Design a protein around this motif. Structure first.
Motif, PDB file in Angstrom:
ATOM      1  N   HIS A  35      24.147  38.457  12.649  1.00  0.00           N
ATOM      2  CA  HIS A  35      24.254  38.040  13.888  1.00  0.00           C
ATOM      3  C   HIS A  35      24.568  36.580  14.142  1.00  0.00           C
ATOM      4  N   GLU A  48      19.612  42.831  18.304  1.00  0.00           N
ATOM      5  CA  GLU A  48      19.102  43.218  16.852  1.00  0.00           C
ATOM      6  C   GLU A  48      17.860  42.461  16.284  1.00  0.00           C
ATOM      7  N   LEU A  89      24.286  42.702  20.491  1.00  0.00           N
ATOM      8  CA  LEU A  89      23.797  41.787  19.094  1.00  0.00           C
ATOM      9  C   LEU A  89      22.608  41.020  19.115  1.00  0.00           C
TER      10      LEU A  89
END
Lengths: 25, 159, 106, 37, 116, 84, 42, 145
Positions: free
Chosen positions: B60, B111, B108
């Motif tokens: 990420h 996550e 994202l």
């Protein structure tokens, strides 16, 4: 949708008790 | 509002004739508007309905630093692509593109939360051990006070 | 009867979900179903959800507490009136943003 | 007492890993940039 | 809520909402006003961009992930059990002392009432 | 002269023993419940993803969101079509 | 991590909810009071 | 896109414990009467009472000459063979508490000077019991008054 006629004595004892032992409240 | 009748009428009767509860299902559930598919990954899945441009590494942080410049440059490119071509169709794909980018950052970033969630769990296990030891030692100390007291009493008694 | 079992499981799950609503219980009390002896038996039977494997498929946990309140056979006599029906309604919601106010207070 | 449930619930709050945001909002002052209706 | 994730998400949303209205606003209202606004808006957007960069370094790395945390919890689970045994070993000594002293005081009271 | 000593000793030990007992009872009540932590996060996300037990930050009176499923969901569910 | 035993957090407990917060905490935790109330029910 | 919370205490006291205790409890007590003591709990309260009663008796003047003392089931069982028997309970511990009378009875019986029916009619025995509870209030002496 009964009394056996002896309260003419036991009552007297209670009175003698109350007259001799006043409630303390 | 309507209660079920033909699956409940057979309750007031004894013996083993009453029906058992249904076993646990291992199939997809159709209840509600939501798909609610069985055995779904805890992490959100962008595999369906979203195109994937992500790297094999799946880190990420690397992507976040790169994504930020791209959205910003596009913002700046969308600013002047209006003057370079007002009647062109590509402006609404750029907004959509922008919308897609917005879908990505949130996807994202999410996550990290599952990992974050796991960390919260460890302290609960950890803190109790930190608390249990104190209680035991405190109890031991309290007991000791009492025992030294009864030894003083046993010293002062027979003399 | 796999289809029958699936449909009965589903419909009883939306039923035990709908027991969370206080206004639904007000409507059921006022329209006149809970006066009999069969529905208290079915509410006795409905306590099977307390197993964690069965309770995983549940999604609103407050229905369990509401059903435990209702099972005492004395709470059912109440909740017919409206001002206490709003009291049980306001108590649940007032706790709901009280959890969010925990962040605000500290 | 011997062992009673302590009020140690706020002390516990300031704990854990890197995710817990450093509460740097106070430092984030005296800038006053950006004004939209 | 003192959460890293909440702060990062909030900053992005403000930028999205703050910049969409601002570009429209610039188109909306037309000497002195246009120039100052350009700087005021650029300033904020610039500030937000800087903040985003600062936020990324703070988050944990690939190492010591969730699986590792679960693994750490394992070893920990065994340790907790042992700790519990400690208190169960400590207890019942007060109980036996208490039953002994209750027997003693009952015997003393009985002797006091029987000596009469 | 021994009753004061015996009294204070038994009171001290009675309070102390009970605290451990109130503690041991809580620990045992915990020990009747043992589950897997792998599914706990899954359940928390499931009840979390939709704002079920947490108040929305952008909540105003008149919000259709309630802890109960409410009228729209109950009428739009399988109960509204299986009544026939 | 299989079969983990974990007691629910009990740090915060509230009797009834109040407007603008102000929760009511009334834990007797007193042995003499506790015995009496239990005794009274008998 | 955003996710507000996980609320681990709620998940852990609903999953591990099959209930939802984190709720304002006023709705239960006002609406529903408090539950009765369990059988196991009853044994525990009785054990505590016997010890307390013994102390009250001893650090005070008491008569063993014509009396009988019973510590069973947290009941006094103080009786005289000749005329009467009484059974008591004291809720309070160290703090002084007025002696409470569960039951007062008379042991004298004669069928013939009555007639087949006992000497005192239950109205009067109800009457006598309250009078005693009255003198005790002052509580200057636990067993001599």
């Amino acid at each position: 949708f009964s009394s056996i006629f002896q309260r003419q004595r036991v009552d007297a004892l209670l009175l003698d008790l109350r007259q001799k032992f006043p409630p303390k409240f | 509002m309507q209660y079920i009748k033909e699956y409940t009428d057979e309750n007031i009767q004894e013996g083993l004739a009453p029906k058992p509860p249904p076993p646990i299902k291992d199939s997809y559930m159709m209840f509600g508007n939501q798909f609610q598919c069985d055995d779904l990954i805890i992490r959100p899945l962008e595999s369906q309905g979203i195109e994937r441009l992500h790297p094999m590494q799946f880190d990420h942080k690397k992507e976040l630093r790169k994504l930020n410049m791209s959205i910003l440059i596009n913002f700046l490119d969308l600013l002047d692509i209006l003057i370079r071509s007002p009647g062109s169709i590509k402006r609404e794909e750029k907004l959509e593109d922008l919308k897609l980018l917005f879908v990505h950052v949130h996807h994202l970033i999410n996550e990290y939360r599952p990992h974050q969630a796991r960390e919260t769990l460890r302290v609960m296990m950890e803190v109790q051990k930190r608390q249990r030891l104190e209680t035991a030692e405190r109890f031991q100390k309290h007991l000791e006070r009492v025992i030294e007291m009864i030894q003083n009493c046993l010293a002062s008694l027979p003399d | 009867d796999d289809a029958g079992n699936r449909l009965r499981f589903q419909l009883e799950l939306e039923f035990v979900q709908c027991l969370a609503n206080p206004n639904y219980l007000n409507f059921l009390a006022q329209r006149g179903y809970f006066k009999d002896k069969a529905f208290v038996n079915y509410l006795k039977y409905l306590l099977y959800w307390k197993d964690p494997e069965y309770a995983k498929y549940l999604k609103y946990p407050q229905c369990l507490h509401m059903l435990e309140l209702l099972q005492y056979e004395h709470f059912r006599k109440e909740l017919v009136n409206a001002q206490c029906a709003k009291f049980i309604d306001e108590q649940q919601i007032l706790h709901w943003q009280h959890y969010s106010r925990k962040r605000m207070r500290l | 007492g011997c062992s009673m449930f302590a009020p140690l619930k706020t002390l516990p709050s300031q704990y854990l890993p890197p995710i817990k945001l450093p509460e740097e909002c106070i430092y984030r002052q005296s800038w006053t940039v950006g004004k939209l209706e | 809520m003192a959460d890293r994730l909440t702060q990062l998400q909030d900053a992005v949303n403000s930028l999205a909402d703050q910049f969409c209205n601002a570009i429209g606003v610039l188109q909306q209202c037309g000497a002195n006003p246009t120039e100052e606004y350009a700087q005021l808006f650029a300033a904020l957007i610039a500030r937000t961009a800087k903040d985003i960069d600062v936020l990324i370094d703070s988050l944990p790395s690939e190492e010591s992930t969730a699986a590792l945390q679960a693994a750490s919890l394992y070893k920990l689970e065994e340790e907790n059990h042992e700790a519990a045994t400690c208190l169960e070993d400590v207890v019942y000594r007060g109980d036996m002392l208490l039953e002994k002293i209750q027997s003693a005081l009952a015997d003393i009271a009985q002797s006091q009432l029987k000596t009469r | 002269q021994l009753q004061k000593q015996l009294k204070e000793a038994e009171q001290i030990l009675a309070t102390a023993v009970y605290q451990a007992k109130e503690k041991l009872k809580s620990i045992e009540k915990a020990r009747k419940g043992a589950i897997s932590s792998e599914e706990i996060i899954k359940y928390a996300h499931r009840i979390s993803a939709s704002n079920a037990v947490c108040a929305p930050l952008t909540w105003v009176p008149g919000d259709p969101r309630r802890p109960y499923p409410t009228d729209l969901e109950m009428r739009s569910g399988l109960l509204g079509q299986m009544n026939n | 991590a299989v079969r983990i035993s974990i007691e629910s957090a009990c740090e915060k407990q509230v009797h009834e909810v109040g407007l603008d917060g102000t929760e009511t905490y009334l834990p007797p935790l007193s042995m003499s009071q506790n015995l009496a109330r239990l005794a009274q029910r008998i | 896109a955003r996710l507000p919370s996980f609320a681990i205490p709620y998940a852990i006291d609903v999953l591990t414990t099959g209930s939802y205790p984190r709720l304002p409890t006023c709705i239960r007590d006002k609406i529903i009467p408090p539950d009765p003591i369990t059988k196991i709990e009853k044994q525990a309260t009785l054990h505590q009472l016997n010890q307390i009663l013994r102390h009250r008796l001893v650090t005070t003047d008491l008569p063993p000459q014509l009396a009988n003392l019973t510590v069973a089931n947290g009941r006094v069982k103080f009786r005289v063979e000749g005329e009467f028997e009484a059974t008591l309970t004291v809720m309070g511990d160290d703090p002084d508490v007025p002696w409470r009378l569960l039951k007062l009875e008379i042991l004298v019986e004669d069928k013939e000077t009555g007639d087949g029916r006992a000497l005192v009619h239950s109205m009067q025995i109800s009457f006598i019991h309250q009078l005693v509870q009255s003198r005790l209030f002052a509580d200057e002496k636990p067993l001599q008054d």
